[PDB]
């Protein structure tokens, strides 16, 4: 290219990312594929069934680690992310004094063996 | 052997359940996987490992919203059906969720809230989350809300709708949305309660010690109140509160059903370190025009009934106490025709919060629910705003290229007139 | 899962084009080759928008280019990321149309269209639920504004219920590079308002200021200048690949900017421009960003708002941030310049935010406005048509293809009534 | 299963 | 290298010494792909 | 256990069996020296198809060559897989046919056979129970035309109760090469009529436009050509040789593609067609396979298919893949091309999938296609016939042979009522009302 054509407010090379504090995020670049050639010639005979396309490889999130890496991260990149952040420490402790429950049908109602009728035999000791 | 299905709509439903759902696992002790480390049952199914489901269904007709519910935290919680996803969205067009789009999913969503209503015994009523600016929040909900009143017949269904603020506003289309839509909810509701934005911004910004709120923080803060709403159902009291009964107290008409909810107290921990907070404040701070969460001055009118949901340590005694003091006091004025306009319930659980939250650890909350005869100012002046767009026909063409009919605007108009000479009908004294 | 067409029409165009998929594969991280070297899985989670899959794990654009000359080509293929299209894609012819209006819609560019036409649709049949269409063109040449009209006209009468938006490099008074362009641009600009659903208009004029005024740019080529259209242009389509606190895709601005079928021309914006030395001393917020967003100096067209009123207002913000600020502001901007909105639509301004910034900064934002303003443009662009028209100059090179007289009256009298249309509703 | 190169 | 050349190549072919060269590039692919597998048929290698 | 007897006659049938041999030999691994080095199993599970086993563990193809110049049999011969073939079924006459179809059929023709069918009969009393006959010719040439006809005929009267399969190369209006290409065309169509089940017609055109803008070849030489025929060839009876999950065999096409029995003009065509500079950036799939079935440019005969309506479509497709993309596919076509399949015939596409794709290749396919827009063809032939035939041109060397002249009035007649049927079947409406109006 002619150096009149070329300028430098945006030089753009292959994408290589600096030391993980220089990104937005706090993840080094992924090596990806490292050999065209096997790229282009070693596929897969195989088709996975849940793909109703196999253009579209992660069709619906199919083995997308965004989950885990929201977690890495000390804050979110994303604000919907900001609500699951907190929970695995507690600050007060649960309350379960005040709770109701179903004390009718855990007393009278019961399931079968017709107790009335049996002679008691194994294992009644009195109260 | 009480529940409630909750579903919600729109973007703005979607991102104010997930901080509900978040609110009550932290309230009953379940981890995100869904197990356990019986007062859950009105929110939760019980599967036979031990897992729980939640009764939620999440509807909307984009994906970019539902995608971060199936890959956040909650991932594993929900149902993997519950989370319903269409393929385009309304765009702010009435006409759009109601005519063209939301007729593809609504056999869908009627399925599943089939299903889930089949292991209801007993069942009693709905929640429904849902914006009135938004097409999915208002187009979508339309016809939803009346295929579900033929298809249940006497079924409680309450509303928690968000409404377009006065001076503030993330569209341009909002009055057209909010005035067709309140036209159908007019006949197909049982009880909607109204939330806006810019007031909650204000409580946020004076009270709440907060330079910098976000969405974030707004739907903790309504979910506390949904919370408080449905905690008599969950836990014991001293005057339990059913979903019927204060339904009961709050319509002395059918065509008005639109009460306001107000919550306190809602401080900072600083604040609270200090200022120790009675019974007689707390109820005191609910009818302060500065800590409203919705944009109306009550000064202006006079309150039709109020209810009154306690939580914690809270004395029978010392709550008809400081009603004495609210009802004596001059600057309070109820209606000539409805002496008696109270009702109180008392619970024994304290609210919880949640870590990374802000609202502090509190013995005792209160929620009081008011029907008010200044909410017509309201309606006043988005009725003038929507008059103002139709005079010279904006944005009509939109609506039209749907299969909308040109009549139903002037009839939604003419509708929300007769709808505010029968509210100026009753606030005369005889 | 939306799915947007990208075609490119014209020289200029093609090079807009050409920088505009080289912002984009550096926003989704991939390398030159086609591989994917990206550090989020954000960044793959919607890559299908603009890019299909190739097999096993290459991405290719979803572009057609067409022009005249195959010597525009020949740089494009051999740019520094040419080798990432399509060989397919590529439709040329062999004689050029010469910045004729007429050759490029009547006798020479109705025979690419038989043949481009089958590649646009085999692209738009093999993507499931696809979105619309996008296009870029300039008015001052044959190739891009003769059969860009005609591409317009044939697609949507072929795909009518669905929605596109052209990015039209205006002509401007004082750059003005060919003698013909006012012929060019007034009988492009009648086929476009009944069959466009939304026009941006870049002027020249409006790029060599930004550089000179606030970029401080001592050689402002136009590798900058697409830069800074291709950046203006990236943003408003963020929402359908990257997730956000409020969503709008592009049918989400089209029906709230757009009031009248025959009001769909579009004055853009960027926000976070800065200079190189002033970069330290501005410090980074959101009330920055709207002092300097509605700037008359940082404006992408050569039209002052000052001279007009503002009809709608669309402003969609990048990057993490809360927007009560975003909503105070725009709040005081519209109560403060009462004179400068029209009053019979309160609440002109729609906002919306999304989570996900450009690559190296914080935040930015990119400002979408109708106005008035555009009737100036339009009024001495038909000015300039009548003063050419009416000693009968330069009729041989157009009435000798074999199109009549009548039609320079008709988009006379199609330019008379829209700037009409436009006066009376200020 | 033995290649052989000449 | 040899495809990088033979996509460098111009989308349109009507001189003498570009079809010789494009012929040349494509013969000589054929060639590399047809070694490279005739390498990958199988692990081990003996040689004569 | 099923045999398939390959009969090469003609210069161009010679060439195309040259390299058939070579393409299905590279299928089931065998070298050039007549062992067999292959990898799987399964290449040798159905080799008695079209190979006979040897002393030695060798393998020789049941095939004949005749030709009425010996000349071509030693290009053919010195080929790279001319080796294989058995000596004894290279049969040659002495003088050339001349482009002359009453010395392939009658004077030179008719010693010669006599030997051909003592080969024949030799080959098809050592198979276990034969399944049909595959001939490859030309009918722009004296002895693929003129002498290709009359072994159909022999044959056939000796086998009744067989299945015949023909790839005949028919003549083309722009690139002819033979000047009495039109009689020879003429008089060897109607034999083809009658003693035939299959006929596959393959044009030199077609073929040329695939070559020059799908593969985008410099120089696509007659090697190239045949390939593509070659391709086309396997593809057919490759349900014989290899397992698949829905099999279909020749009397499965026969059946399904043969509504009645004077229509059986078939346009082939072999899916998956890459350049090589555009090998590496397009996605093999199923709908893309589906997609390079139906386009005009893809044909091997070249008569453009939406002057006319389908009668019959087969698909048979090989390689690992599942069939509901398949059926969704051949549904969404039918569905919306309705007024380019015929209404009063449902379902008009038969499918066919196999599990062995061809080597070098992820999924391939063939196409098969009875359509009434082979008509042109044969009114094109008629119109030169007739036209040449108005001056009584070159007769006298057709005549000096025996021939009479009503024959070639015959010929013609027999054309245009072929032609009709081929018109009032594509007017034909599901409804006898609707039409005589
Ligand atoms: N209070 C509150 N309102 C919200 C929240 N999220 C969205 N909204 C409301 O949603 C309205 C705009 O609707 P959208 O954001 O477009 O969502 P929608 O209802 O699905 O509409 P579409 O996206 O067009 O389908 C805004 O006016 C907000 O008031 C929230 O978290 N809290
Ligand atoms: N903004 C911008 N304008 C350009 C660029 N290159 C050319 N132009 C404009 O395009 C006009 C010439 O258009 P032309 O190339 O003849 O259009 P075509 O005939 O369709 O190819 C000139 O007046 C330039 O101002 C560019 O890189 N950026
Ligand atoms: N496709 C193709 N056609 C061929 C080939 N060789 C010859 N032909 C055709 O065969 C015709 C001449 O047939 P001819 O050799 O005279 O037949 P014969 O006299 O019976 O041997 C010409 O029109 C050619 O187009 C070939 O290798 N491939
Ligand atoms: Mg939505």
Same mark, same amino acid.
């Given at each position: 290219?002619?150096?009149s ?24 670049? +992924? ?16 088709y ?7 253009? +579209? ?15 890495? +991260? ?11 952040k907190?929970?695995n ?6 309350? +379960? ?6 004390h ?18 194994f ?5 | ?5 909750? $579903?919600?709509?729109?973007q ?17 002790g379940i ?6 480390? !019986?007062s ?36 594993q919680?929900?149902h993997?059906?519950?989370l319903?996803?269409?393929?385009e ?7 759009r ?39 999915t ?6 016809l ?6 033929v ?5 409680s269904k ?12 993330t569209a ?17 509701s ?12 204000? $409580? ?6 907060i ?17 408080? $709403? ?56 609910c ?38 003091? $609210? ?10 025709w ?5 009702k109180?319930?008392?619970?024994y ?37 929507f ?27 003419? !509708? ?15 | ?43 793959? %989670? ?21 022009? *005249? ?6 740089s ?11 060989p ?8 050029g ?12 560019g109705?025979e ?6 089958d590649?646009?649709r ?15 063109? #300039? *008015? ?56 466009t659903?939304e026009?941006?208009?870049i ?67 960027? =926000? ?15 009330? %920055? ?40 502001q ?8 009462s ?24 935040? #930015? ?21 009548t ?5 009968k ?15 320079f009256?008709? =988009? ?7 700037? #009409? ?6 | 299963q ?5 | 290298?040899?495809? /990088? ?12 010494? /570009? /079809? ?12 590399l ?7 990958? /048929? ?7």
């Amino acid at each position: 290219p002619p150096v009149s054509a070329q300028s430098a407010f945006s030089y753009i090379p292959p994408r290589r990312l600096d030391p993980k504090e220089h990104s937005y995020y706090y993840r080094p670049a +992924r090596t990806g594929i490292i050999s065209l050639y096997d790229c282009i010639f070693k596929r897969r005979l195989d088709y996975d069934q849940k793909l109703h396309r196999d253009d +579209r490889e992660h069709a619906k999130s199919l083995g997308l680690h965004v989950n885990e890496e929201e977690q890495e +991260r000390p804050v979110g990149v994303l604000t919907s992310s900001v609500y699951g952040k907190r929970i695995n420490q507690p600050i007060e402790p649960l309350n +379960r004094d005040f709770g109701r429950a179903n004390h009718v049908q855990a007393d009278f109602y019961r399931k079968n063996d017709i107790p009335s009728l049996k002679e008691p035999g194994f294992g009644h000791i009195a109260p | 052997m009480r529940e409630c299905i909750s $579903i919600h709509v729109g973007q703005a439903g979607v991102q104010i359940g997930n901080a509900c759902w978040e609110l009550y696992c932290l309230e009953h002790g379940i981890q995100p996987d869904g197990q356990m480390p !019986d007062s859950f049952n009105t929110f939760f199914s019980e599967t036979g490992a031990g897992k729980h489901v939640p009764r939620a269904v999440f509807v909307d007709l984009e994906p970019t919203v539902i995608d971060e519910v199936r890959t956040g935290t909650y991932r594993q919680l929900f149902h993997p059906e519950q989370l319903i996803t269409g393929k385009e969205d309304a765009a702010n067009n009435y006409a759009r969720g109601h005519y063209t789009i939301g007729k593809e999913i609504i056999d869908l969503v009627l399925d599943r809230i089939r299903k889930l209503a089949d292991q209801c015994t007993g069942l009693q009523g709905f929640l429904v989350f849902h914006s009135f600016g938004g097409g999915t929040g208002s187009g979508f909900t339309s016809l939803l809300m009346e295929r579900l009143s033929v298809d249940y017949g006497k079924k409680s269904k309450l509303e928690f709708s968000i409404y377009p603020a006065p001076q503030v506003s993330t569209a341009v289309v909002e009055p057209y949305n909010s005035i067709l839509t309140t036209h159908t909810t007019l006949e197909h509701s049982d009880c909607a309660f109204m939330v806006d934005n810019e007031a909650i911004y204000d $409580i946020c910004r004076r009270n709440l010690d907060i330079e910098r709120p976000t969405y974030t923080n707004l739907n903790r803060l309504i979910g506390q109140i949904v919370s408080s $709403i449905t905690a008599s159902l969950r836990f014991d009291g001293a005057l339990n509160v059913d979903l019927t009964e204060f339904q009961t107290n709050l319509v002395p008409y059918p065509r008005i059903h639109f009460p306001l909810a107000t919550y306190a107290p809602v401080i900072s921990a600083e604040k609270a370190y200090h200022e120790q907070l009675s019974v007689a404040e707390i109820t005191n701070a609910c009818f302060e025009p500065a800590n409203q969460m919705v944009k109306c001055d009550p000064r202006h009118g006079k309150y039709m009934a109020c209810c009154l949901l306690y939580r914690g340590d809270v004395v029978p005694k010392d709550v008809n106490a400081a009603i004495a003091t $609210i009802k004596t006091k001059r600057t309070i004025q109820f209606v000539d025709w409805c002496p008696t306009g109270f009702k109180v319930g008392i619970n024994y659980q304290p609210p919880t919060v949640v870590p990374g939250g802000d609202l502090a650890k509190v013995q005792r909350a209160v929620c009081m629910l008011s029907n008010t005869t200044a909410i017509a100012e309201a309606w006043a002046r988005l009725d003038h705003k929507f008059d103002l767009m139709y005079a010279k026909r904006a944005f009509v063409h939109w609506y039209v290229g749907e299969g909308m009919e040109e009549g139903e605007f002037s009839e939604a108009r003419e !509708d929300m007139a007769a709808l505010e000479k029968d509210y100026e009908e009753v606030g005369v004294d005889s | 899962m939306r799915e947007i067409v990208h075609l490119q029409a014209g020289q200029c165009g093609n090079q807009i084009g050409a920088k505009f998929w080289e912002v984009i594969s550096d926003e989704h991280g991939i390398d030159p080759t086609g591989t994917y070297h990206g550090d989020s899985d954000l960044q793959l %989670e919607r890559i299908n928008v603009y890019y299909n899959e190739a097999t096993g794990g290459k991405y290719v654009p979803r572009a057609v280019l067409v022009d *005249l000359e195959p010597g525009t080509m020949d740089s494009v293929r051999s740019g520094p990321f040419g080798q990432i299209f399509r060989p397919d894609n590529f439709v040329f012819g062999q004689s050029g149309a010469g910045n004729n209006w007429a050759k490029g819609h009547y006798t020479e560019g109705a025979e690419l269209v038989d043949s481009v036409l089958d590649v646009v649709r085999k692209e738009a049949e093999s993507c499931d639920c696809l979105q619309g269409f996008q296009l870029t063109h #300039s *008015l001052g040449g044959g190739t891009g504004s003769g059969m860009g009209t005609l591409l317009i006209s044939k697609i949507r009468e072929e795909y009518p219920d669905r929605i596109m938006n052209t990015f039209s490099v205006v002509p401007s008074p004082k750059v003005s590079d060919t003698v013909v362009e006012p012929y060019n641009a007034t009988l492009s600009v009648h086929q476009l308002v009944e069959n466009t659903d939304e026009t941006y208009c870049i002027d020249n004029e409006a790029l060599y200021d930004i550089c000179f005024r606030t970029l401080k740019l001592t050689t402002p080529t136009y590798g900058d200048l697409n830069h800074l259209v291709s950046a203006t242009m990236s943003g408003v389509t963020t929402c359908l690949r990257f997730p956000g606190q409020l969503n709008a895709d592009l049918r989400k601005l089209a029906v709230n900017m757009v009031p009248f079928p025959r009001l769909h021309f579009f004055m853009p914006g960027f =926000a976070p421009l800065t200079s190189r030395g002033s970069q330290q001393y501005r410090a980074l917020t959101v009330p %920055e960003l709207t002092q300097q967003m509605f700037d008359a100096k940082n404006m992408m067209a050569a039209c002052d708002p000052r001279h007009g009123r503002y009809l709608t207002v669309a402003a969609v913000f990048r990057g993490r941030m809360s927007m009560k600020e975003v909503d105070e502001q725009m709040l005081n901007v519209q109560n403060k310049n009462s004179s400068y909105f029209v009053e019979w639509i309160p609440n002109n301004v729609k906002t919306a935010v999304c989570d996900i910034p450009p690559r190296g900064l914080k935040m #930015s934002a990119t400002f979408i406005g109708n106005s008035t303003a555009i009737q100036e443009l339009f009024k001495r662009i038909s000015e300039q048509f009548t003063a050419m028209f009416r000693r009968k100059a330069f009729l041989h090179w157009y009435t000798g293809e074999g199109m009549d007289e009548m039609e320079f009256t008709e =988009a006379e009298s199609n330019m008379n009534d829209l700037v #009409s249309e436009y006066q009376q509703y200020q | 299963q033995v290649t052989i190169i000449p | 290298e040899v495809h /990088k050349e033979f996509q460098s190549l111009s989308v349109f072919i009507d001189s003498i010494p /570009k /079809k010789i060269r494009k012929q040349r590039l494509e013969e000589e692919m054929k060639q590399l792909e047809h070694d490279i597998g005739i390498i990958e /048929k199988h692990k081990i290698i003996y040689i004569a």
